């Protein structure tokens, strides 16, 4: 995948966004912007040019599942990769992510190596 791929990192905790952005940088992805919930995310997405979303699940205003469904049903954004992040792998939550079209699913906390593994799985399926 292209090093300049533009990421949106979505989490209501600024520290978690900083951490994910730093892991992305460690992997060579420097083109990263942030959003604090699903509403904020959709606002920022209107700027265009985004190529990959990493989203938390539990957020106020619009949560990560609501965000994912909106992106998947959107005329312009329907095929955007979305890596969903959760605090605990539970069957119900994983199955909800699958039904909604999550590109990937990773449980916090995770290493750069795990992040690279999950990104690569998504790139491979999508032919990126």
């Amino acid at each position: 995948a292209d090093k300049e791929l533009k990421f949106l990192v979505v989490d209501d905790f600024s520290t978690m966004r900083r951490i994910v952005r730093n892991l992305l940088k460690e992997l060579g992805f420097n083109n990263v912007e942030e959003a604090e919930d699903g509403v904020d995310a959709l606002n920022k997405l209107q700027a265009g040019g985004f190529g990959f979303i990493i989203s938390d699940w539990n957020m106020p205003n619009m949560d990560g599942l609501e965000l994912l469904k909106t992106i998947r049903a959107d005329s312009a954004m329907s095929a955007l990769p979305v890596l969903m992040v959760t605090a605990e792998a539970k069957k119900e939550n994983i199955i909800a992510a699958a039904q909604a079209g999550a590109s990937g699913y990773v449980v916090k906390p995770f290493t750069a190596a795990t992040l690279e593994e999950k990104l690569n799985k998504i790139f491979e399926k999508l032919g990126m």
Partner: peptide, 11 residues
């Protein structure tokens, strides 16, 4: 069933 469900999903 968790890591195994994840595999099935390609997650």
């Amino acid at each position: 069933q968790v890591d195994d469900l994840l595999d099935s999903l390609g997650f």
